[PDB]
Structure formats: C-alpha cells, structure tokens
From a paper:
Subclass B3 PBP (known as [name] in Escherichia coli and encoded by the [name] gene) is active during cell division and localizes to a multiprotein complex termed the divisome, where it functions in PG synthesis in concert with the division-specific glycosyltransferase FtsW. The catalytic serine acting as a nucleophile in the transpeptidation mechanism is also able to react with β-lactam antibiotics because of their structural similarity with the d-Ala-d-Ala motif; the resulting covalent intermediate, however, has a very long half-life (with turn-over constant k3 ~ 10−4 M−1s−1 or less), effectively leading to irreversible inactivation. AiCuris previously reported on the development of a novel monobactam ([name]), which shows remarkable inhibitory activity against PBPs of Gram-negative bacteria, and good antibacterial activity, even against clinical isolates harboring several β-lactamase classes.
Diffraction quality was generally superior when compared to EcPBP3ΔTM crystals, with moderate anisotropy and usable resolutions of 2.2 Å (crystal form 1), 1.8 Å (crystal form 2), and 1.9 Å (crystal form 3; for details refer to Table 1). In fact, the head subdomain (T77-R152) appears to largely bend as a rigid body, leading to slightly different orientations. In the TPd, the largest differences between the three apo-PaPBP3ΔTM structures concern the β3-β4 and β5-α11 regions, both of which show indications of high flexibility. In crystal forms 1 and 2, eight and six residues are not resolved, respectively, while in crystal form 3 nine residues are missing.
Author numbering: 56 to 190, 210 to 491, 500 to 561
Write the structure that this text describes.
C-alpha cells in the first residue's frame, strides 16, 4: 500500500484557512461477512439513514463480492458511532475531504479539486504540484500555500459587489483590489459565484472567473495612459488647451463623437474630466499611436499576466507599422483594444505606484520584486493629480469620492464586441500617496443596452473606504 499524500493547506495572506483537507470517515463492508449477521441489518440500516429493504437489497445483490462501500464522507464522530455497533463485516477507513471554509466568497480564486483529489480550477490547479505531494512506501505531504488575498477585503468586496448588482438588477460583475507597491491581488470577486463545497449542482455561468477571462474594450479607462504618452512626448503640458467644439470630429469617412458635446476649449485635465473622445484623439494625432501603444503595452494591457491561471485570456493590443487616424483615435479613447479586469487593475497599479510596474501575484509577496519604471515619476504624479480631479472637481465623478480620503480614478463604458454593455470604474487611493488600486466591472447595470451609466463608482467608494480602513491607511483628506 503506497500511502497517498496529504493535500496542502491554502490560507489567505494572514493565515485564514481557505482550503483545508479535513479528515472524513468511509464505512465499507465485506458482503460474505455481513451475510452472517442479517439480524443486525435493520439497526445498521437505521444508523446509516437508509431504508431497511433498500439496504438489505444492496448486500444480497452484491453478496458474491468482497468489497462494497456503505457510506463515504462521514465525520469522524459519526463513523465511530456505527463502528461501535460492532456489526460483523463493517470496516472503516479514514479519508480526506477538501473543504473550503469561505465557500462562495473565494470560489473563483481558490478553485476546487475533482473526485481523485486533483486540482481542476483556480489556485488548486495552478499550484497542484505544490499542494499535492508524492505517494512500505513513504508518502510526503503537500506544501502550504498562502495567497495574496486578504479575506477581510474579500468579504467586503464580495458583499458590496453583490449588493450593487441586486440594487441595479445587473447580470454579472467583477471587482479586483490590488496592492500597488507589491503587485499582490488583495481581493478578486466575481458574480455570479458558486459554492465549491455544494457542487451537487454545477451552473456553468457561475464558474466563470470573469475578472480574468472576460475581455472588454476598456473605453475611457485607458485615456489616462494616452495622456501619459502625451506628457512623456515633450509636446504637451497640463496647461495646454484643446478645442473640442462641436463635440464631433470628422476624419474622412469616420466621425469621432463625444458622449458630452457641450464644450469648446478644455485643458488636459478637462479632457479627462469631460472624457472627451475628440480631445484625446487630437492629442493622439499629434504624438502618434506608437507612443500610446508603447505605454499600454508596457503597463500590461493585452499582455500575459504570468499568473498561470487556467483559461486566462490575454486580450488583444493591436499593433501596426502604419497607424491611420481611425486606428489612432480608437486606440486613444479605448475602443481599439480589449483587456481583462485584472490587466486594467495591473495597469492602474503601475500608474499609482508612481509609474513603476510590479508583476502580478496571487501568492503572498515577502520580498517585493524590482519593478520596471514604465511611466516617469513626474508624469505619473501629474496624471495622478488629474485623476484626483476627475473624482473631485466640478462635473467630476463625485459618487467615487471616499470619505476622509482623496480618491482618484476614471469611469468608462465597456463594450464586448452583437455588443454588450459593461460599466467600468478604475481608480486608486489615497491620491496623494497611493496604496490600493481597484477595478469595478458591472455587466449591464439595468439591462443589456440600458441608461444606468455611472453605477460602478459608488461601489469603488464603499469598497475603497473599507479597504483603506482594514489596512489602517492614514486619511489624507481631513477637512
């Protein structure tokens, strides 16, 4: 008997158990031996919770066999209660059942194991070799894995994303919380979600890890990165003015149209506040799409994350030797590419980390890796101040303001090309010394093609406020 291996424990970043192999008890029987004690069967059938006739049927039907299971997955205490009856032919072997104490809250991140206790999805699959040991014959146990997830932030993001969808009647949603300095994924919740313990049913739409496999056109949420390429070109400064009247711009056959068409002159910050597609397009025409593509590619948009998660969609950041005006514009205002919510959070973390990009991590980061300075500290600081103005200035996204803090971020309207409406908000806080980056995705707020609009911003406000408190970040907006 080459003994099996004990599956390693998965915890959150602070040791809270997320996937523990708990001991269970399995009762089996030798039918030829049980046949000599038929008068014990009604008592034994009752202790197993089974019908007297149906239980007697199983034994007599498999009388020539010498091994059948009576019941698997019992608790140690319940298994000893039946063994205490000392019915001839009833034997016991203690097994291991994978249990997930957090249940549906970390379902998509943790994943699950199959019948042969092998990693099938989530972390259970990405670290299956690490969590499963090797099978007298000596058997070594599996190693412990501590995730980057903060279970406190995870519970917060889960219930706030759930409460927001029920309030608006949305079909689905995603929320990613990220530590901008360490690259750690502090929280990643998806709706709808399933219970990995209660897998009698198996709804396929609930097992969808949308934060990593759903791709969408980020829209205005990448305009800060176009602005970053403008500021790094040496041709634009924050006081420069762009004329966006009358809210439309004709480029040959196509016509760029702004969502709000009530502006004429805007400075660079007002282009972000008003979220003008015309304004960001005129900037892109001057600096060229290559400088914008380079920034988006360096912050990870459309790039492999390196997390090794199953089903991870990379997205698509198109590249061209020669960029026409149409492809330049659509890239500049976020409809010329497709990303995941994880990639968008990673890119915002770089901007918040004063322009230094750090590799994503699903496990706890002890030694912080050397970053890549993608955006200069001076340009990153300037864009940070602009995104703070997007949230705090006149006509800005006021629903995203965090009480007692200076928050910064950008709202968008994603499109999955038949097309699908998603509401986006990506941000970080505190604006004056960023610690946390967050991306909120809401699939069709009211309905598919509705008029809800800014629905993700209030979720950003409530979750960021809680995450800053849970991490004891000092308030920097004390009036």
């Amino acid at each position: 008997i080459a003994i099996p291996a004990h599956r390693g424990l998965i915890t959150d970043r602070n040791g809270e158990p997320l996937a523990v192999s708990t001991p269970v008890t399995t009762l089996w029987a030798n039918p030829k031996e049980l046949m000599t004690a038929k008068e014990r069967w009604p008592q034994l059938a009752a202790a197993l919770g089974q019908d007297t006739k149906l239980f007697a049927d199983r034994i007599e039907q498999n009388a020539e066999r010498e091994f059948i299971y009576l019941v698997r997955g019992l608790t140690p205490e319940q298994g000893e209660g039946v063994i205490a009856l000392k019915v001839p032919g009833v034997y016991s072997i203690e097994e291991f059942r994978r249990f997930y104490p957090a249940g549906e809250v970390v379902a998509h991140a943790v994943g699950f194991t199959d019948v042969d206790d092998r990693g099938r999805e989530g972390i259970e699959l990405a670290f299956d070799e690490w969590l499963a040991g090797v099978p007298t014959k000596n058997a070594k146990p599996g190693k412990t894995l501590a995730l980057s997830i903060d279970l406190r932030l995870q519970y917060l993001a889960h219930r706030e994303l759930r409460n927001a969808l029920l309030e608006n009647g949305a079909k689905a949603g995603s929320l990613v919380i990220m530590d901008v300095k360490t690259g750690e994924i502090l929280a990643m919740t998806n709706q709808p979600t399933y219970n990995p313990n209660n897998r009698r049913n198996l709804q396929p739409a609930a097992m969808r890890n949308r934060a990593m496999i759903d791709v969408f056109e980020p829209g205005s949420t990448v305009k800060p990165f176009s602005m970053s390429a403008a500021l790094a070109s040496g041709r634009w400064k924050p006081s420069d003015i762009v004329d966006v009247y009358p809210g439309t711009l004709q480029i040959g056959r196509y016509t760029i149209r702004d969502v709000s068409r009530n502006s004429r002159q805007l400075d660079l910050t007002g282009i972000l506040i008003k979220s003008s597609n015309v304004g960001i397009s005129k900037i892109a025409f001057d600096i060229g799409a290559e400088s914008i593509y380079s920034v988006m590619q360096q912050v990870g948009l459309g790039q492999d994350t390196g997390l090794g998660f199953p089903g991870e969609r990379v997205g698509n950041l198109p590249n061209h030797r020669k960029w026409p005006k149409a492809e330049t514009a659509t890239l500049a205002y976020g409809y010329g590419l497709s990303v995941t919510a994880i990639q968008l959070a990673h890119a915002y973390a770089a901007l918040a980390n004063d322009g230094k990009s750090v590799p994503l991590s699903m496990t706890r980061v002890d030694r912080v890796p050397d970053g890549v300075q993608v955006i200069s500290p001076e340009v990153a600081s300037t864009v940070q101040g602009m995104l703070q103005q997007v949230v705090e200035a006149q006509g800005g996204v006021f629903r995203a303001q965090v009480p007692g803090y200076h928050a910064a971020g950008k709202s968008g309207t994603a499109r999955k090309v038949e097309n699908a409406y998603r509401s986006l908000f990506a941000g970080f806080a505190p604006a004056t010394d960023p610690r946390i980056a967050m991306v909120v995705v809401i699939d069709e707020p009211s309905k598919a093609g509705y008029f809800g609009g800014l629905v993700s911003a209030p979720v950003f406000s409530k979750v960021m406020a809680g995450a800053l408190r849970l991490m004891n970040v000092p308030p920097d907006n004390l009036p």
